[PDB]
Amino acid sequence: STEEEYVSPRFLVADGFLIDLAEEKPINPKDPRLLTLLKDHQRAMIDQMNLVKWNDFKKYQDPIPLKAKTLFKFCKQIKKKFLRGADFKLHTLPMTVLASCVPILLDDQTVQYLYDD
């Protein structure tokens, strides 16, 4: 869903992502440290929310376009250089642009990037 969802005072869901409001970044819903950080009931609410599975990003060679409504309001951004492709979207550097982007760390220690489509 698009609508913002309460999990705890520290944790919010927006645009398919769970956001750590204290660190101002998304966190993988399957991050092992949510066992400490959230109670059972709160983790159970997250399972009922159909969030983006971060494992699906593993293959992606390009940064990730999101038709987001609110996510970028809560997350620290950096500016990164990308190729602007003829598909009008961003592609990794081997026409360039700088984009405000949200870095995310994956299971295997790869860095991906969410940007606002």
UniProtKB/Swiss-Prot annotation:
Tell where it localizes.
Nucleus; Chromosome, Centromere
Task: Please tell me, according to the UniProt entry, what happens when changing residue 7 to G.
Answer: Abolishes interaction with ORC1
Positions of the region ORC interacting region (OIR)? 1-117
Outcome following mutation: residue 21 to P: Abolishes interaction with ORC1
Report the outcome of residue 54 to R.
Abolishes interaction with ORC1 and SIR4
* Transmembrane intervals: none
Question: Its function?
Answer: Involved in the establishment, but not the maintenance, of heterochromatic silencing at the cryptic mating-type loci HMR and HML. Is recruited by interacting with the ORC1 subunit of the origin recognition complex (ORC), which binds to HML-I or HMR-E silencers, DNA elements that direct the formation of silent chromatin at the mating-type loci. Establishes transcriptional silencing by recruiting the three other SIR proteins, SIR2, SIR3, and SIR4, that function directly in silenced chromatin and establish repression. Also found in centromeric chromatin.
Assembly state and interactors?
Interacts (via OIR domain) with ORC1 (via BAH domain). Interacts with SIR4. Interacts with CAC1.
Q: What is this protein called?
A: Regulatory protein SIR1
Q: Which gene encodes it?
A: SIR1
Instruction: Tell me the part of the parent protein that is shown.
Output: 460 to 587 of 654
